[PDB]
Amino acid sequence: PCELDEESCSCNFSDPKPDWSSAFNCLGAADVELYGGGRSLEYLLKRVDTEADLGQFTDIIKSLSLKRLTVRAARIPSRILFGALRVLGISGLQELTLENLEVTGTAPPPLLEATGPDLNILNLRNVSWATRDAWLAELQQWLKPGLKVLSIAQAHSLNFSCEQVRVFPALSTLDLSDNPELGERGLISALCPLKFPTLQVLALRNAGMETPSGVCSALAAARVQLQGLDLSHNSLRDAAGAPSCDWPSQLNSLNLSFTGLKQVPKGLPAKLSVLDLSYNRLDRNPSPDELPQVGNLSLKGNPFLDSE
Amino acid sequence: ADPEPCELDEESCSCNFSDPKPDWSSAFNCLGAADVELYGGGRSLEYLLKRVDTEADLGQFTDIIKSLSLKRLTVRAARIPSRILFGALRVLGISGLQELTLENLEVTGTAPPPLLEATGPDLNILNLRNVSWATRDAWLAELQQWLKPGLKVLSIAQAHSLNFSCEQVRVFPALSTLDLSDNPELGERGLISALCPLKFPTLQVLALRNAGMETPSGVCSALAAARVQLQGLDLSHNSLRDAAGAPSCDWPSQLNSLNLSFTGLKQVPKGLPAKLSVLDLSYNRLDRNPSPDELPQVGNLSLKGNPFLDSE
Numbered sequence: 001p002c003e004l005d006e007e008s009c010s011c012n013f014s015d016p017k018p019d020w021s022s023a024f025n026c027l028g029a030a031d032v033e034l035y036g037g038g039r040s041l042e043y044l045l046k047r048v049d050t051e052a053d054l055g056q057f058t059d060i061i062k063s064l065s066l067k068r069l070t071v072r073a074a075r076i077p078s079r080i081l082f083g084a085l086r087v088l089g090i091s092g093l094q095e096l097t098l099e100n101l102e103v104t105g106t107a108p109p110p111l112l113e114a115t116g117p118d119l120n121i122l123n124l125r126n127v128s129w130a131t132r133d134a135w136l137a138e139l140q141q142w143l144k145p146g147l148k149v150l151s152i153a154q155a156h157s158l159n160f161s162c163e164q165v166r167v168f169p170a171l172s173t174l175d176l177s178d179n180p181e182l183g184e185r186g187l188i189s190a191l192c193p194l195k196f197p198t199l200q201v202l203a204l205r206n207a208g209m210e211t212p213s214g215v216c217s218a219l220a221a222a223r224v225q226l227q228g229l230d231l232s233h234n235s236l237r238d239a240a241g242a243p244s245c246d247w248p249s250q251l252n253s254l255n256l257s258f259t260g261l262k263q264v265p266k267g268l269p270a271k272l273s274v275l276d277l278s279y280n281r282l283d284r285n286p287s288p289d290e291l292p293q294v295g296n297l298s299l300k301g302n303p304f305l306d307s308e
Numbered sequence: 309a310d311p312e313p314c315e316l317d318e319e320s321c322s323c324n325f326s327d328p329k330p331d332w333s334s335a336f337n338c339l340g341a342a343d344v345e346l347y348g349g350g351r352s353l354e355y356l357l358k359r360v361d362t363e364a365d366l367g368q369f370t371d372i373i374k375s376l377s378l379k380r381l382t383v384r385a386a387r388i389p390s391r392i393l394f395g396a397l398r399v400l401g402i403s404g405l406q407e408l409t410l411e412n413l414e415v416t417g418t419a420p421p422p423l424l425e426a427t428g429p430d431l432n433i434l435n436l437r438n439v440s441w442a443t444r445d446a447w448l449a450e451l452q453q454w455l456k457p458g459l460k461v462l463s464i465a466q467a468h469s470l471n472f473s474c475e476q477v478r479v480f481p482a483l484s485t486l487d488l489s490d491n492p493e494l495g496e497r498g499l500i501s502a503l504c505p506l507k508f509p510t511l512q513v514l515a516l517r518n519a520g521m522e523t524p525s526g527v528c529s530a531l532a533a534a535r536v537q538l539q540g541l542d543l544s545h546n547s548l549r550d551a552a553g554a555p556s557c558d559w560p561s562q563l564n565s566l567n568l569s570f571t572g573l574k575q576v577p578k579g580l581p582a583k584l585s586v587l588d589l590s591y592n593r594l595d596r597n598p599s600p601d602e603l604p605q606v607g608n609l610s611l612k613g614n615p616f617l618d619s620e
């Protein structure tokens with residue numbers, strides 16, 4: 001079922017009733033990967049108690065060497081998900097990665113506050129929830145305040161009910177890459193106002209973005225402040241977009257690589273530390289004023305450079 | 309009060325043989341170490357000539373030498389007679405030594421040319437820093453007599469002489485990186501005397517940091533005179549001048565990387581290649597962001613650190 005190959009323990013519970021004892025092998029192992037194989041775990045509701053204070057195990061959990069957890073392909077009910085979260089709370093788990101999960105049913109709000117792994121990194125990819133516009137607000141109810149990196153991919157919904165969303169005090173990186181249906185307007189509905197006081201980096205790769213100015217527009221609407229913005233891998237268009245917009249005053253790094261650009265876009269910030277404009281379709285070398293003052297400029301890959 | 313000469317780790321064996329003429333015993337401690345450094349404290353090893361037979365076949369140690377885990381060797385601070393240095397080179401030849409670094413040495417006397425050809429370690433890398441030789445312009449030809457044709461990297465720092473007699477110098481079949489950094493007196497004319505015609509067919513990278521260069525075009529000119537071809541040129545840490553230099557010069561056709569960082573440049577110099585993959589112009593003194601034509605077509609441009617960007 002499981003296997004402690006070096007630091008990893010690819011604990012596999014695809015088969016109906018698994019050999020959980022194996023799990024005790026996935027102990028002392030810093031990296032753990034759980035593959036539910038799409039198997040439903042709604043039968044654990046009748047078997048386990050979510051308010052369980054595993055006396056017998058408390059010390060094990062607190063002594064585990066676990067640091068990076070991945071949980072993929074499984075139809076887990078909300079109750080068991082957060083149950084596990086609460087349990088992990090007393091462990092030293094730093095990074096969590098939920099993937100291809102169908103979290104079902106509603107769970108009651110937790111009693112106390114901040115019950116949860118003191119995570120630095122939380123990654124979600126193709127996770128569906130019982131509710132759909134409040135899943136973020138609810139998951140927050142079990143998260144600690146030190147979260148630094150939040151990655152959300154292929155969400156079925158990001159149009160948050162922002163009044164219920166809370167402040168992410170330490171969140172320095174928000175990665176909404178791979179949400180082809182998000183869009184600039186959709187981006188405004190995701191970046192809840194005043195909820196990312198410390199954001200420094202915002203990644204939006206392959207997220208339906210159309211123009212840098214349009215994105216700047218959304219950033220101003222969201223009253224967001226930040227240092228880096230990655231827009232690589234979007235199909236940016238040759239268009240006016242928003243004719244006027246001030247970029248966040250702290251913006252010093254813009255990525256526009258692999259966005260199929262044919263012209264340098266207008267409305268770029270005036271001064272930048274780095275501007276990655278590589279692997280696009282510029283057929284002419286950028287003119288003087290056409291570009292911002294850049295400390296590090298990349299144009300590698302464009303047609304005008306190839307001399308094949 | 310028992311510090312043995314060579315202290316071993318698992319890969320790094322460091323030896324100290326500075327004591328007034330003793331303890332050669334340690335060494336067998338190094339056996340099995342990938343890296344080895346031999347410090348001689350500047351002591352003179354000239355006494356080894358009356359004791360060791362430059363030709364003697366180390367039969368008793370031959371296998372040991374053939375079984376050493378030795379890959380990178382550094383030999384520094386010592387006055388070693390030529391005969392001994394090449395004697396050792398010959399010896400290591402049967403070992404799997406890949407990189408050699410000689411530094412702060414005073415190689416003395418002369419040595420007879422080797423009967424055979426290519427009797428030395430099969431090096432990928434050879435480094436010299438502040439090494440002096442008996443002769444002074446033939447030293448490169450002579451050292452060559454003992455080297456294998458597979459050398460990929462030759463680095464020469466603080467040399468007392470780079471004005472080689474090129475007719476004697478032979479081809480470096482595989483040399484791809486030639487590093488002449490730290491030769492402040494070299495200059496652009498002196499560079500021409502170091503780049504022996506046709507001796508570096510496969511050169512790809514030429515590094516010339518802190519080597520008295522003055523203008524990119526003056527360097528280009530030197531390269532043209534040497535009929536040298538290459539892909540990368542590093543001129544960082546030279547005090548490049550605000551001057552015309554050579555008003556006309558075609559760059560080697562394969563050049564795609566020019567480094568002009570930390571050269572105190574105040575203006576974008578003229579005479580740059582038409583197009584480059586990378587142009588590193590950072591940490592200079594540009595007070596104005598470079599104009600259009602002023603720069604070449606560049607894939608990767610760096611201008612970080614210049615004053616025009618500081619907004620302090």
Ligand SMILES: *[C@@H]1O[C@H](CO)[C@@H](O[C@@H]2O[C@H](CO)[C@@H](O)[C@H](O)[C@H]2NC(C)=O)[C@H](O)[C@H]1NC(C)=O
Pocket residue numbers: 037038039073074100101102126127128
């Ligand atoms: C996204 O995740 C969902 C999980 O809910 C995937 O769909 C499930 O896939 C498993 C197979 O592992 C099936 O047993 C479930 O019945 C599926 N449920 C649903 C929602 O239909 C879906 O395939 C994933 N998408 C991608 C691109 O991986």
Ligand SMILES: *[C@@H]1O[C@H](CO)[C@@H](O[C@@H]2O[C@H](CO)[C@@H](O)[C@H](O)[C@H]2NC(C)=O)[C@H](O)[C@H]1NC(C)=O
Pocket residue numbers: 205230232233255256257258274276
């Ligand atoms: C700008 O965006 C590009 C494209 O996303 C970045 O290149 C990727 O970098 C990640 C990060 O390590 C790699 O995993 C990918 O393999 C890279 N993509 C490709 C196809 O090379 C690039 O690093 C960004 N540039 C800057 C200045 O950060």
Ligand SMILES: *[C@@H]1O[C@H](CO)[C@@H](O[C@@H]2O[C@H](CO)[C@@H](O)[C@H](O)[C@H]2NC(C)=O)[C@H](O)[C@H]1NC(C)=O
Pocket residue numbers: 349350351385386411412413414438439440
């Ligand atoms: C360059 O290497 C030479 C060695 O050939 C150094 O000069 C010798 O230094 C030792 C000290 O360890 C003295 O005992 C010798 O008498 C010196 N010989 C000479 C040539 O006078 C010289 O110091 C080295 N330069 C640097 C910067 O280290």
Ligand SMILES: *[C@@H]1O[C@H](CO)[C@@H](O[C@@H]2O[C@H](CO)[C@@H](O)[C@H](O)[C@H]2NC(C)=O)[C@H](O)[C@H]1NC(C)=O
Pocket residue numbers: 517542544545567568569570586588
């Ligand atoms: C251009 O040259 C500079 C300066 O020589 C390079 O920066 C140095 O790179 C070395 C070797 O990797 C580092 O160990 C030093 O710390 C760097 N020096 C300084 C002062 O920062 C730079 O990498 C070169 N540019 C390119 C494109 O390779």
Ligand SMILES: *[C@@H]1O[C@H](CO)[C@@H](O)[C@H](O)[C@H]1NC(C)=O
Pocket residue numbers: 159161189
């Ligand atoms: C976005 O959120 C608003 C506010 O709840 C809602 O009225 C609207 O239908 C949502 N639109 C989408 C695309 O989900």
Ligand SMILES: *[C@@H]1O[C@H](CO)[C@@H](O)[C@H](O)[C@H]1NC(C)=O
Pocket residue numbers: 471497501
């Ligand atoms: C190099 O050395 C030779 C012999 O000492 C000398 O005659 C010649 O002028 C030198 N060449 C240059 C260009 O310095």
